[PDB]
Every structure is written in C-alpha cells, then in structure tokens.
Amino acid sequence: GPYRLRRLVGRGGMGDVYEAEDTVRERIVALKLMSETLSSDPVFRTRMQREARTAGRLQEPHVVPIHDFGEIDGQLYVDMRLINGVDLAAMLRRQGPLAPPRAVAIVRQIGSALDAAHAAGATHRDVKPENILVSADDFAYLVDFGIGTLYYMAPERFSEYRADIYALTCVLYECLTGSPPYQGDQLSVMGAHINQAIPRPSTVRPGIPVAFDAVIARGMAKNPEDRYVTCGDLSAAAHAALA
C-alpha cells in the first residue's frame, strides 16, 4: 500500500516478511504479509490479529516494536521496526561455541522477551536460535520467524505449562558446548528428551564452569515442576554460574 516491497527476508508462521519502504512515514521497516489471503477464513483472521494486538501491547525492549497493523487490499499486514544482525544459528555455525558470559548475556535478553510475552498472555511454546537475532553490541531480539524443531522441545508437548523455559535451556546449552543437547534423528531425539539423562555441559568444552550442569539440569529437568518458573530465574542462575 503506502509501502513498496523489497528483499524477501524472514519466513514467519502464517506470513512472509519483506523489507519495505514506508513512503508516508519515510523510513525502512519490516513488513509481514499473511500472503496469498489464507485468512479469508475468520479463524485465521481473528487469531493473527489477536496475537498481533498482544504483540504491540508489549513494552519489553528485546521484542521488535510493532508500528502498525490492519488491512490493505484484503491483505492483513503487520508493520514493524527493521533490525540488523545475524541468527544465533548463523553465529554458532560461523563462530563455534560462545564464551560463556556472552552466551549468558544473550540468554538473559531473550528470556526477558519470553517472560514479557507470557505475561501479556502470548506464551511462546518454544525458542529456536533461528528466532534469535544478534545486533550491534550483542543486542538480541526475540523474533517470530526464520529467513519449529524437536531439538528444543519439552516432553510434555508430545502428549497431554510454559515450555519456552525448557527450550531456552537447550539453546543455552548449545551456545556453550557448540551443539544441541540431543543429537540424532527426529525419532531418537524425541525419545532422548523424554528419557535420556540430561547432559553436563562442563564435560564437553574446557572453559565451562561446573555450576552450569546444575542450571541445565534444572532448566531441562524432566518434570515441568522441577524447572525454573521463569526465564528470569533461568537467567539469574545462569549468570550466577560464572565464577
């Protein structure tokens, strides 16, 4: 509409994100388009405008600001602040494991975003490193797109809770060691989460403090009620695990 599409980057759940120039507002923004009018159906319509409304209610600074949303030309849009940086997924591939304080710094900011989300009643079922965008000075945003996998999934999700705390702890693990806690294929991984002994990160890389195994053990403890209640408490413990 008032916008003019540009480079296809980002691949959200229901929509596909483009970079876009807001010609009225005279700035470059990220714009998600729920493409091809899949939500002619009111069930998609109301849902993706319900959580769009909760998204722009958020005030936490590690969540992308929402500029605007509504309809133009039948198409439902969400206009948001454009951010630069790389995936945690991209970092890890290209940089190996992170120095623990860096890992912690990143986990702290995303857990913060997650807590805020939960608090406004838009709980994320999980986190992928591919949903973590690291900017200038290790500033990280939680984004809802790419450019879900079993590597980061709590067991309670497979049958009949806040599962994001579990996910974040897998993500923390990966930042430390270099790889997700459970390897193998979808079957063996799914099983590993239900059953395999939680890994002890210090037993992999040299420079990882002991206190962390406890954090990971708690953070991806088997019974949901044994884990941290917030990502904040995760963060706190993680932080405290630097000697």
Confirm if 156 and 194 have CB atoms less than 8 A apart: no
Residue 56 is given by DSSP the state T
Active site residue 73: no
Identify the CA nearest to 11 among candidates 40, 28, 29, 34.
34
CA 47 to centroid of chain Cα atoms: 20
Confirm if 129 and 210 have CB atoms less than 8 A apart: no
- Mask of contacts with Na ion, 116-155, x by CB under 5 A? --x-------------------------------------
| Stretch binding Na ion (CB under 5 A), from 45-53, 87-95, 147-155, 158-166 | 158-166
Helices (H), the chain: 42-55, 88-95, 100-119, 164-177, 186-195, 211-219, 231-240
Nearer to Br ion, 29 or 98 (CB): 98
Residue with tokens 């722009």: 56
Name the binder of 28 from Br ion, Na ion, none, CB < 5-8 A by kind.
none
Is 232 annotated as contributing to ligand binding?
A: no
- In angstroms, rounded to a whole number, what is the distance separating the alpha carbons of residues 216 and 177? 12
State the number of binding residues for Br ion (CB under 5 A): 3
Is 128 annotated as contributing to ligand binding?
A: no
Nearer to Br ion, 102 or 218 (CB): 102
Nearer to Na ion, 162 or 222 (CB): 162
| Stretch binding Na ion (CB under 5 A), from 12-20, 110-118, 138-146, 234-242 | 110-118
Helices (H), 120-163: none
- Cα 134 to Cα 56, 114, 119, 129, 205: the distances in Å are 21, 16, 23, 10, 23
Is 24 annotated as contributing to ligand binding?
A: no
Confirm if 22 and 28 have CB atoms less than 8 A apart: yes
Shortest gap between Cβ of 38 and Na ion (angstroms)? 29
Residue from 32, 62, 162, 222 in contact with Na ion (CB under 5 A): 162
Asked if residue 94 binds Br ion (CB under 5 A), the reply is yes
Name the binder of 94 from Na ion, Br ion, none, CB < 5-8 A by kind.
Br ion
Count the residues in the chain: 243
| Stretch binding Br ion (CB under 5 A), from 4-12, 23-31, 87-95, 145-153 | 87-95
Confirm if 170 and 220 have CB atoms less than 8 A apart: yes
Asked if residue 62 binds Na ion (CB under 5 A), the reply is no
- In angstroms, rounded to a whole number, what is the distance separating the alpha carbons of residues 82 and 167? 25
Name the binder of 118 from Br ion, Na ion, none, CB < 5-8 A by kind.
Na ion
Nearer to Br ion, 179 or 196 (CB): 179
Is 153 annotated as contributing to ligand binding?
A: no
* Catalytic member of 87, 115, 126, 164: 126
As annotated, the binding site for ATP includes: 9-17, 32
Give the residue numbers marked as catalytic.
126
Q: Footprint of Na ion on this chain (CB under 5 A)?
A: 118, 162
